[PDB]
Amino acid sequence: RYRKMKERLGLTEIRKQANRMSFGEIEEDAYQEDLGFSLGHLGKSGSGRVRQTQVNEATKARISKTLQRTL
Amino acid sequence: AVQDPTKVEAHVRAQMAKRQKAHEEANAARKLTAEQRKVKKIKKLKEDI
């Protein structure tokens, strides 16, 4: 249980990479509706890795037990 | 397991075999003998007289 709950709340590589931000490399302001929203090294061609990051399956949104039984 | 892998695996399988042996002897200490099963069936099928 502790391992599963730590993996769910753990800082995934894609979420780790959005935390960062390049120094002096100014990003274009995507997402009009809220400026300041910026992905980190996700696609900014900064200092990340060559391949695209993959979504962690443990972060996939799921529904409750009572909600499922009502469904 | 890094230090002595085979010894550790042998210990783990010893624990597994101990659990299985305990389960099997618990099943055996209750298992009804053939004479007991026969007398049980006969007594169940007899008493409607």
């Binding site: - | 002595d4 892998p5 695996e9």
Partner: protein
């Protein structure tokens, strides 16, 4: 391992080849017990490659058939040879680093077997009885 050397050193026309380092181990031991045994053996061969060669043959028969690479040995003797191999690795580490093998902790031995350990130069400073002085 002299089989790999005898193959590669006298080979031409580069070609792919497949091996199996879990010769017959998987019939009796698990996968990551076989991997740990392989790691111990490979660390030993990295350490000496000749003392471990003698250790890999506890007898003079030691039937290492050409069908596979490692000697056909039993698990009970595998425990003993692993103990000797671990002792060899620790003894070499102590000889090279002037440390005491009995003084090594458990995680110290794990780090010795797996990878390597970090040193500490004099430039690394921990700047992070009383004598009164009149000034």
């Amino acid at each position: 391992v002299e089989k790999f050397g005898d193959l590669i050193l006298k080979a031409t026309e580069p070609q792919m080849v497949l091996f199996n380092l879990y010769d017959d181990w998987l019939k009796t031991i698990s996968s990551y017990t076989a991997f740990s045994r392989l790691i111990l053996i490979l660390r030993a061969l990295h350490v000496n490659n000749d003392r471990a060669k003698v250790i890999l043959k506890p007898d003079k028969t030691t039937i290492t058939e050409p069908h596979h690479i490692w000697p056909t040995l039993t698990d009970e003797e595998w425990i003993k040879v692993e103990v000797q191999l671990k002792d060899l690795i620790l003894a070499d580490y102590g000889k090279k680093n002037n440390v005491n093998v009995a003084s090594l902790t458990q995680s110290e031995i794990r780090d010795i077997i797996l990878g390597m350990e970090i040193s500490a130069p004099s430039q690394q400073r921990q700047q992070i009885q009383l004598t009164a002085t009149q000034t």
